[PDB]
């Protein structure tokens, strides 16, 4: 059961470097590629993320795509950069210019065929292929346009597998780019049709995690990308280690998605605590469960108390009792019953894995399907309607070739997604 990862654009390549560092560390792979681990439990599932090259070496199943090689030269210069296969770096000669239309129509169609050849070469080598995993930002230019182009092509070529995405979306307060609403709206329109499961992260939530929970004095993008790499590496843990109650991406989708359009989820990771405080509190299932539902540890700006949970999933790593998990999930469902959708008799799925992440006795990653995600899309749609009524910067997109009808279609599709979430929020048994 092998996963193929795709990292696109600056954010994707930067998050990918830390993800592959975390994965290489847990399996004890040196930056030269040599296995140096100390237990057979590490080797028996190495195939899941690494292919074996001759005389000991392992190579990571990842495709790197970008329109300007600056980021690729930075990742090749990094401490683990050597592990990546040289033929897997694909780059053009001019930037996306922060424009969705360039990334989707002009340089996208020029490079996309070489990316499809690399993705097919990587997919057909697996004895059994599991879903793809993609990291990219929706606010950028090549990430949104070329990522969604490639997602559409892979969904045409492999419609029976799973499609999973990790995506960065613009903060309502911390904008980095003026034309963010167009790129975000067009990308969300593409994702809601093509994707099977989509996770959303706000940089503001990672800053609030660092300042309030970790009390870091001077955080950097390396810390944010480490938190993201930790949560990304945690969801797949039951695929690649033994446990008392195994779980899988398809089983997560079956328990989390009630209706096919409702596939947007919130993320959280529990054992976060400052270096000064850690000597004062031991790990236990009640402490992880209490932090896991605290909105302070949840990675989007929308707050759960304004919505309702349709479904949720918790994956536990470590040597621990199943009774405490079952009774904790029952206690949280019973005391806060108003925040759970009443027409589903049990909203939480649990899973237990024997091997915790290195240096922690136990850990849990939380995936949540909550209607409060509608607030982010509404904010993007308001800013889009303010900009679109005046054709504020539209000549760039029209000069690349886009018809105005795509903007009205993407706006209508996002408005219907917000409406469908709002209808399930206010549904009743009657």
């Amino acid at each position: 059961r092998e996963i193929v990862c795709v990292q696109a654009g600056q954010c994707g390549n930067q998050i990918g470097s830390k993800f592959w560092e975390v994965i290489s560390d847990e399996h004890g792979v040196d930056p030269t590629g040599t296995y140096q681990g100390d237990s057979d439990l590490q080797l028996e599932r190495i195939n899941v993320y690494f292919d074996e090259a001759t005389g000991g070496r392992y190579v990571p199943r990842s495709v790197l795509i970008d329109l300007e090689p600056g980021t690729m030269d930075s990742v090749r210069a990094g401490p683990y950069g050597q592990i990546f296969r040289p033929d897997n770096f694909i780059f053009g000669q001019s930037g996306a210019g922060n424009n969705w239309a360039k990334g989707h129509y002009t340089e996208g169609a020029e490079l996309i065929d070489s990316v499809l050849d690399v993705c097919c070469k990587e997919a057909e080598s697996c004895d059994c292929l599991q879903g793809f995993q993609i990291c990219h930002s929706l606010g950028g230019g090549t990430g949104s346009g070329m990522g969604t182009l490639l997602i559409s092509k892979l969904r045409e070529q492999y419609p029976d597998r799973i499609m999973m995405t990790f995506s960065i979306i613009p903060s309502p307060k911390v904008s980095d780019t003026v034309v963010e609403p167009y790129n975000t709206t067009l990308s969300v329109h593409q994702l809601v049709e093509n994707s099977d499961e989509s996770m959303c992260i706000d940089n503001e939530a990672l800053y609030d995690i660092c300042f309030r929970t970790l009390k870091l004095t001077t955080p950097t993008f390396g810390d944010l990308n480490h938190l993201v790499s930790a949560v990304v590496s945690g969801v797949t843990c039951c695929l690649r280690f033994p446990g008392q109650l195994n779980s899988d991406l398809r089983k997560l989708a079956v328990n989390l998605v009630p209706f096919p359009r409702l596939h947007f989820f919130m993320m959280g990771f529990a054992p976060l605590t400052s270096r000064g405080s850690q000597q004062y509190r031991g790990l236990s299932v009640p402490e992880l469960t209490q932090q896991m539902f605290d909105a302070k540890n949840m990675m989007q700006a929308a707050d759960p108390r304004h919505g309702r949970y349709l479904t949720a999933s918790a994956l536990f790593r470590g040597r621990m009792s199943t009774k405490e998990v079952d009774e904790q999930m029952l206690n949280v469902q019973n005391k806060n019953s108003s925040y759970f959708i009443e027409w589903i008799p049990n909203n939480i799925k649990s899973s237990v894995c024997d091997i915790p992440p290195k240096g922690l006795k136990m850990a849990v990653t939380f995936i949540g399907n909550n209607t409060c995600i509608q607030e982010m899309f509404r904010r993007v749609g308001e800013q889009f309607t303010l900009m679109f009524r005046r054709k504020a910067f539209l000549h760039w997109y029209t000069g690349e070739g886009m018809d105005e009808m795509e903007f009205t279609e993407a706006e209508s599709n996002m408005n219907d997604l917000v409406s469908e979430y709002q209808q399930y929020q206010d549904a009743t048994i009657e």
Partner: protein
């Protein structure tokens, strides 16, 4: 949104009378007692009418038999 104190984190005992998902079962039993009573009443009525039709058929047979005997 509170998880509550630690001493109240344990398993609540199961009481099927106060289980919200079994109320139609108890309502069904409470209806079933009277349904059984009225079924018993209907059953005795059917038994009586069966006896009546048997008696009428017996009388008809006796009339036919005596007519068939007297013709000789």
């Amino acid at each position: 949104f509170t998880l509550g104190p630690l001493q109240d984190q344990s398993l609540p005992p199961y009481n099927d009378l106060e289980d919200p998902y079994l109320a139609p079962y108890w309502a069904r039993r409470e209806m079933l007692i009277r349904e059984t009573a009225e079924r018993r009443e209907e059953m005795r009525r059917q038994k009586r009418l069966e006896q009546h039709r048997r008696e009428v058929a017996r009388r008809r047979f006796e009339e036919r038999r005596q007519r068939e005997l007297e013709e000789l």
